[model samples]
Target: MSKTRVIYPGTFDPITNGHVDLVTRASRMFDEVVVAIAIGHHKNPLFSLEERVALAQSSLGHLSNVEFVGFDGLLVNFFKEQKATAVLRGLRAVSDFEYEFQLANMNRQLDPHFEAVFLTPSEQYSFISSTLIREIARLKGDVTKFVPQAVVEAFERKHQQGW
Candidate 1:
């Protein structure tokens, strides 16, 4: 039997509960789920790659079929390196479809066998995003509901240090 591995690549700057939901579902459907954190220098993420990876690990460590890794450069290259059967993306709304579709098409063009799989977060988490989470946490707003406990604690530390 062939095992299916999917690469879930993202900045994951303090992974939100929405992200956790997607990965949790992906883990159940796919033989292996790789939570690939992007070294997104251009995005200027609040959390460093190491910090993001650690936070994600703390949040998702309960899943036996899930793993984490930090990657830089093109996702197609990383996908090949991981021998992933597909790239998993989470769509929170119809607005996300346009951008995600373009990315899927581009990846498929780069590698004919490349596949893009889409999943929507549960209704409760559909509105949560890492960007908004950062914004709220930066302003000292409570984000306990949108992110995991590790993320909440990390944000608390950053704010306490005046970051």
Candidate 2:
């Protein structure tokens, strides 16, 4: 039988340690992982697609079975293209849960075979998010405790709101 891999799709503007945590936990359930960097031209993302891919790759480099790719349009399509059996998300909070729940339903509507799996990040990282990370860093507060070092540098490098 072929190995069953997962498609962990997200903007991944700068992959965080928490996101890495999701990948690690998901690894136990799946044979391989593909960090799918979804490109969004509408939002004018903080990091370019290439930068996101690089960040995801660098953050998850130790996963020998992991691959990184840039994608656009519907996520279910990418799942089909990659032949991925699952879509993974890292739940950080109630607000995140709301969005993730909606996303899961939407992906299922788009493609019934695309299973969305939610994983609770370690409690240590329950409060971390790119939004707060950027906010704290902007205020010159310590965001170092929130995100991975490379992600911290990326936030420092791209200080704009990307609006």
- lDDT for each of the candidates? 0.92, 0.78
TM-score of 1: 0.97
Q: Which pairs clash (backbone N, Cα, C closer than 3 Å) in model 2? A: none
Give the per-residue lDDT of model 1 (tens digit) for 80-120: 99999999999877879999999999988998889999998
Which candidate tops TM-score?
1
* Residue-level error in angstroms, candidate 1, position 101: 0.8
The CA lDDT at 42 in model 2 is 79
User: How many clashing pairs does model 2 include?
Assistant: 0
Model 2 C-alpha lDDT versus the unseen true structure: 0.78
lDDT accuracy of residue 139 in candidate 2: 73
Query: Which 10 residues in a row give candidate 1 its minimum summed lDDT?
Result: 40-49
Q: Model 1 Cα displacement at 138 (Å)?
A: 0.9
TM-score of each: 0.97, 0.87
